Design a binder for these strands. Structure first.
Length: 175
RNA sequence: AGAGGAAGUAGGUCUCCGUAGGUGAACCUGCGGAG
C-alpha cells in the first residue's frame, strides 16, 4: 500500500473545484487546495505502481496547466508524455531581453504560432512564463522543443514552421 | 495664303492577481504586475 501527495499552484483552483479518479483507477483521493496538496492512495482495488504513477502524472499535469481533455488523454494513452522546459536553459545571448521578446516570437499574436505548431506536430503545449510544458509522444515533444529553441535562436516563424511541417510529414510516414 | 517639282527620316498566446468603467454576485472590456 502506497500513497503519494502532490502540491498544486493557486491558479487552477476552481478548475480543480469542478468535478472521478476513484472510478478511473480505483485509487482513493483526498484534496485540500488551501494546503495546496492532493493525496493519491492505493486501496485494495488499485493493482499497479503504474496506475499510481500515471494518476500522479495526470494530476500534476493538470496542475502544470493543461485541461481535462488532454488530461484524460494522458490518463488513457500509456505511451503519452509530459515535459517541463525552462527558458533559462541554454542561452544564446546574456542580455536580459530574454523573456518578453522570445516568448513574443514563440507565442505570437492570438497564439497563432503556438496553435499552429500544436496542429502541425500533433502535440499540445502550455506556456507559463519561464516554464513551458510540452505534451505528446516523445518524438513530438523533442520536435516541439527544437522548434522552441530555434524560435528563441532567431529564425523566423515562416522558415521554422516550414521545416517543422516537412519533418512532421517525414516523421509521420511509416515507410 | 498656294497647289505643285524634288529629296530625305518613320509578431506576448494561456492562466492567476491588482485595477478603472460597463448591468449587476458573477461576468465583459481597458490598464498595470506575476507564472
Amino acid at each position: 500500500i502506497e500513497t503519494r501527495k502532490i502540491p498544486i499552484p493557486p491558479h487552477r483552483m476552481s478548475a480543480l473545484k469542478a468535478n472521478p479518479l476513484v472510478d478511473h483507477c480505483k485509487l482513493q483521493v483526498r484534496m485540500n487546495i488551501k494546503e495546496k496538496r492532493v493525496e493519491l492512495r492505493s486501496s485494495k482495488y488499485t493493482v499497479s505502481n503504474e496506475a499510481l504513477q500515471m494518476g500522479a502524472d495526470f494530476v500534476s499535469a493538470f496542475a502544470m496547466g493543461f485541461d481535462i481533455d488532454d488530461a484524460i488523454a494522458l490518463l488513457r494513452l500509456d505511451s503519452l508524455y509530459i515535459q517541463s522546459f525552462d527558458i533559462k536553459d541554454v542561452r544564446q545571448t546574456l542580455g536580459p531581453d530574454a523573456l518578453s521578446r522570445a516568448i513574443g516570437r514563440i507565442a505570437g499574436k492570438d497564439g497563432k504560432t503556438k496553435f499552429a505548431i500544436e496542429n502541425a506536430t500533433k502535440t499540445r503545449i502550455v506556456l507559463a512564463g519561464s516554464k513551458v510544458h510540452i505534451l505528446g509522444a516523445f518524438e513530438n515533444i523533442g520536435m516541439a522543443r527544437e522548434s522552441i529553441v530555434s524560435l528563441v535562436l532567431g529564425a523566423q516563424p515562416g522558415k521554422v514552421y516550414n521545416n517543422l511541417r516537412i519533418i512532421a510529414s517525414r516523421m509521420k510516414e511509416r515507410w
